mmCIF file of C-alpha atoms and ligand atoms in Angstrom:
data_model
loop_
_atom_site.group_PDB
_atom_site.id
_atom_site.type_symbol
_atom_site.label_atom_id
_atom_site.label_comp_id
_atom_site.label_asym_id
_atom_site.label_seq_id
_atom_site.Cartn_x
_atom_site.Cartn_y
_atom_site.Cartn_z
ATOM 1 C CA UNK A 1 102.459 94.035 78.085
ATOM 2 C CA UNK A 2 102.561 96.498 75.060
ATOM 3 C CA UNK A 3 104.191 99.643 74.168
ATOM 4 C CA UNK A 4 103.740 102.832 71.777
ATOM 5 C CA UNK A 5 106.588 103.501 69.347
ATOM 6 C CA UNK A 6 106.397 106.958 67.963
ATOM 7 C CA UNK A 7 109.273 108.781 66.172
ATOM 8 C CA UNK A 8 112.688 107.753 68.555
ATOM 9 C CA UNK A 9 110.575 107.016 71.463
ATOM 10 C CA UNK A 10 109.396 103.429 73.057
ATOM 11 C CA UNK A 11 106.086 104.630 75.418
ATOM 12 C CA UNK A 12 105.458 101.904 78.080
ATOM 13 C CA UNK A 13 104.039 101.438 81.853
ATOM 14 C CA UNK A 14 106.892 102.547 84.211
ATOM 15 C CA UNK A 15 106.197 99.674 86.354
ATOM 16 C CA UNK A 16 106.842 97.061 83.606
ATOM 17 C CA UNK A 17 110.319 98.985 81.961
ATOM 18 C CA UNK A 18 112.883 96.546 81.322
ATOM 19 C CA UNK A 19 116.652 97.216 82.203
ATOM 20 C CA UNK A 20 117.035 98.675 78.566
ATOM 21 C CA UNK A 21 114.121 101.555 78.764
ATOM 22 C CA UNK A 22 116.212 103.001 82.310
ATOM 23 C CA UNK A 23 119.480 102.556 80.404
ATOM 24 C CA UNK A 24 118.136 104.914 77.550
ATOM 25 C CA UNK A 25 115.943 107.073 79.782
ATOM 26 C CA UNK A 26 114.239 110.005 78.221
ATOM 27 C CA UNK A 27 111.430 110.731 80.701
ATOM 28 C CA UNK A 28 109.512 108.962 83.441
ATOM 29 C CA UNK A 29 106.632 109.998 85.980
ATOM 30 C CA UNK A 30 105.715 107.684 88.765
ATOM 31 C CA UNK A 31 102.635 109.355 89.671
ATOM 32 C CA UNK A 32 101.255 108.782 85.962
ATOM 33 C CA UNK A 33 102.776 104.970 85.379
ATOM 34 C CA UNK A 34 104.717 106.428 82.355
ATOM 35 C CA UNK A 35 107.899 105.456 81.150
ATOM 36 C CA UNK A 36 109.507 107.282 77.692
ATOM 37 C CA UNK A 37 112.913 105.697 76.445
ATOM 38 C CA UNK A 38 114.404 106.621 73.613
ATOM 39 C CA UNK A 39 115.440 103.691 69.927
ATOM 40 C CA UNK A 40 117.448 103.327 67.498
ATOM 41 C CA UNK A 41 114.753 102.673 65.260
ATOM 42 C CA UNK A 42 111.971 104.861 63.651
ATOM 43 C CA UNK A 43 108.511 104.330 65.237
ATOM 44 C CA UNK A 44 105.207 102.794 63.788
ATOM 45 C CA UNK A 45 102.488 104.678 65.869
ATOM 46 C CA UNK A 46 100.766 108.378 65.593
ATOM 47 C CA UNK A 47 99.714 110.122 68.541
ATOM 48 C CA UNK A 48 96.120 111.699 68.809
ATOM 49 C CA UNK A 49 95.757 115.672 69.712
ATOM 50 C CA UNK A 50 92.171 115.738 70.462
ATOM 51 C CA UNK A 51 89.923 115.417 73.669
ATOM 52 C CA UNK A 52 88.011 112.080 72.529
ATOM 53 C CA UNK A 53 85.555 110.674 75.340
ATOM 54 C CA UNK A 54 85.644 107.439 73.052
ATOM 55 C CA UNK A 55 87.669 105.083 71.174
ATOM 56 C CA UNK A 56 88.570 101.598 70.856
ATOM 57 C CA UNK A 57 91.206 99.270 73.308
ATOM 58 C CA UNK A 58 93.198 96.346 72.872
ATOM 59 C CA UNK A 59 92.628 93.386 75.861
ATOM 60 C CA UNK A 60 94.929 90.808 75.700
ATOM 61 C CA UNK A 61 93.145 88.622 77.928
ATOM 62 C CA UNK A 62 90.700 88.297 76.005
ATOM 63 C CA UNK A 63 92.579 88.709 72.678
ATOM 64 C CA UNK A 64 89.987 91.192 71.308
ATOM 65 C CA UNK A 65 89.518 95.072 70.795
ATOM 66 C CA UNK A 66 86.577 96.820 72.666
ATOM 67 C CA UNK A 67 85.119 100.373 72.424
ATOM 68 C CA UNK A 68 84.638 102.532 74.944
ATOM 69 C CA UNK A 69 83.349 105.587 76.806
ATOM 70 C CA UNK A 70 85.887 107.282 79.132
ATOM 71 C CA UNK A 71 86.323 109.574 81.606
ATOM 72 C CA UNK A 72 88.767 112.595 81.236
ATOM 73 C CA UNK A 73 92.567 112.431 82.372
ATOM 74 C CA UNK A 74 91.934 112.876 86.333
ATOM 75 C CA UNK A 75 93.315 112.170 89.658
ATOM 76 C CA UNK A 76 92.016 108.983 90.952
ATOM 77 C CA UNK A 77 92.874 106.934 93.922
ATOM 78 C CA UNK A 78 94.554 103.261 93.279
ATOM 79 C CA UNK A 79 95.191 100.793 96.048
ATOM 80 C CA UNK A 80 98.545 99.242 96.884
ATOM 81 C CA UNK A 81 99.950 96.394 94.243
ATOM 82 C CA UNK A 82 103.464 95.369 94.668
ATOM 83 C CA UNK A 83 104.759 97.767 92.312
ATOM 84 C CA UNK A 84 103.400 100.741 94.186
ATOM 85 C CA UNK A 85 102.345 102.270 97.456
ATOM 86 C CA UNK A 86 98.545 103.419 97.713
ATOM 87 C CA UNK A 87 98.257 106.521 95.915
ATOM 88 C CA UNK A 88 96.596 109.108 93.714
ATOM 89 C CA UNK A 89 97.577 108.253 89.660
ATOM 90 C CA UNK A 90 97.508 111.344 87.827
ATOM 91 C CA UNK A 91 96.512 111.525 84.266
ATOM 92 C CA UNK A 92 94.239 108.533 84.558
ATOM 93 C CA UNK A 93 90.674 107.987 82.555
ATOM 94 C CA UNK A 94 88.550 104.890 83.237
ATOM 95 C CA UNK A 95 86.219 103.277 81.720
ATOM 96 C CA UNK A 96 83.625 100.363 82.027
ATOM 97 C CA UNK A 97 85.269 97.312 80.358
ATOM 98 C CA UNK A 98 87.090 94.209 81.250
ATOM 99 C CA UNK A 99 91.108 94.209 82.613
ATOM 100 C CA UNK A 100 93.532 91.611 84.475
ATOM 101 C CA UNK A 101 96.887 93.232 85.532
ATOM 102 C CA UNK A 102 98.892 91.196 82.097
ATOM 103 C CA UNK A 103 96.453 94.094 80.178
ATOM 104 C CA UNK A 104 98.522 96.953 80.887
ATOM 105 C CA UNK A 105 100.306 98.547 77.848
ATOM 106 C CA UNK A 106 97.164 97.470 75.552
ATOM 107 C CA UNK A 107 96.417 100.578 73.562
ATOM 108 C CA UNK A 108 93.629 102.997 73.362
ATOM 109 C CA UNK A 109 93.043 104.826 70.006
ATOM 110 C CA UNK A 110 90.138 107.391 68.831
ATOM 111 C CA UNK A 111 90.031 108.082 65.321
ATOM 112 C CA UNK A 112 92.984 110.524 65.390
ATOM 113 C CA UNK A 113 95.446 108.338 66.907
ATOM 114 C CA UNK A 114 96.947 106.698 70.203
ATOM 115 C CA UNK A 115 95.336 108.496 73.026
ATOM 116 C CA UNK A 116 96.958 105.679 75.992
ATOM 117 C CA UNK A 117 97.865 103.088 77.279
ATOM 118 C CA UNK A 118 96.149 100.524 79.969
ATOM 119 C CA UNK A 119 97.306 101.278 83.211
ATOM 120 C CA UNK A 120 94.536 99.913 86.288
ATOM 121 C CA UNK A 121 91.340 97.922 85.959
ATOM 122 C CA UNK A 122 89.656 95.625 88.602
ATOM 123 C CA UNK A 123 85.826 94.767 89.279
ATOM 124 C CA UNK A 124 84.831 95.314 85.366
ATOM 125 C CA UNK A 125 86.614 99.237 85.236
ATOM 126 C CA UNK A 126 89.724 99.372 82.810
ATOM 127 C CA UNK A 127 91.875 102.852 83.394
ATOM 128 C CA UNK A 128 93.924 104.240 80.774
ATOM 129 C CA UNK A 129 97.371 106.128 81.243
ATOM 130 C CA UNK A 130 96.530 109.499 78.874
ATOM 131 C CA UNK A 131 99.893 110.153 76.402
ATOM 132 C CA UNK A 132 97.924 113.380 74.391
ATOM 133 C CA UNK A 133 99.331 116.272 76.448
ATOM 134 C CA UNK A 134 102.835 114.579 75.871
ATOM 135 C CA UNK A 135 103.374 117.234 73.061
ATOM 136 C CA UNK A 136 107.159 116.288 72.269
ATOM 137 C CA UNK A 137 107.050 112.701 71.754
ATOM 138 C CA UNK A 138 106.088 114.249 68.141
HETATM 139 N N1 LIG B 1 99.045 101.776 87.614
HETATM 140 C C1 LIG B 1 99.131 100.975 88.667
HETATM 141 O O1 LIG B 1 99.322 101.389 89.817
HETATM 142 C C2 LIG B 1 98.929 99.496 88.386
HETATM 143 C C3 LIG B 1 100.211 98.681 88.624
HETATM 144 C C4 LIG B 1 99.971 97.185 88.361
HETATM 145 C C5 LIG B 1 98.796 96.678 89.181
HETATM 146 N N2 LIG B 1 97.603 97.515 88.956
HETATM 147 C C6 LIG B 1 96.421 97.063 88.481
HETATM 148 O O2 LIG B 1 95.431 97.780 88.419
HETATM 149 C C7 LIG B 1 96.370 95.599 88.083
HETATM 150 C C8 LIG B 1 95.014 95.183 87.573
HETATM 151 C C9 LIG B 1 94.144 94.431 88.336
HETATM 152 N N3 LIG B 1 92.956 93.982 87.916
HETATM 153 C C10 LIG B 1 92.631 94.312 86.668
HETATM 154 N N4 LIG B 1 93.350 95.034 85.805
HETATM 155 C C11 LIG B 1 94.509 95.440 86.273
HETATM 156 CL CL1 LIG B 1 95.525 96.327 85.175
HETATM 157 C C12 LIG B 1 97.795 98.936 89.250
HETATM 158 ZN ZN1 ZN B 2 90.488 111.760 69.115
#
């Protein structure tokens, strides 16, 4: 679980919106795992504008932060869970580090901000949702 709260927007993984994110929809994209809903509240997070390779992620299951080298937003092929069809995720970096499915929404920052959220993982990968090109959440 986890989500990023930036200005009058609540960032989280489309597959784990509650009934309150589709009742105050802003934007959503199936083919990145992104959900955008919109709060009443002003947000706590910044959003990085940069193309960092690196940065830092949150695991819950492990309750620790680990850095990491990963790959740029891409196309890449994840099998079938039961919250999707087999299919190509757009937008998606990975990385070598450790993941169980309860680690999506943990964030991934670079020294300029959030730069995403976890999305896949399996077999010692970890693969981040990106949320930089996402220029109006600002
Ligand atoms: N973005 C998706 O299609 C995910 C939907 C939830 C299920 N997905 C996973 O990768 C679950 C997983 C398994 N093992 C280790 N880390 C993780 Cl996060 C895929
Ligand atoms: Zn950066």
């Amino acid at each position: 679980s986890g989500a990023i709260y930036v200005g009058n927007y609540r960032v989280v993984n489309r597959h784990l919106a509650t009934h309150n994110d589709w009742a105050n929809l802003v934007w959503e994209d199936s083919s990145r795992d992104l959900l955008v809903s919109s709060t009443t509240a002003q947000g706590c997070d910044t959003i990085a504008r940069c193309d960092c390779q690196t940065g830092v992620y949150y695991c819950s299951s492990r309750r620790k932060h680990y850095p990491v080298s990963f790959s740029k937003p891409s196309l890449i092929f994840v099998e079938a869970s039961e919250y999707y069809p087999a299919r190509y995720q757009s937008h998606l970096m990975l990385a070598v580090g450790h993941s169980e499915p309860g680690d999506c929404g943990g964030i991934l920052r670079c020294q300029h901000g959030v730069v995403g959220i976890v999305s896949t993982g399996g077999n010692g990968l970890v693969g981040f949702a990106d949320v930089r090109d996402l220029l109006w959440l600002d």
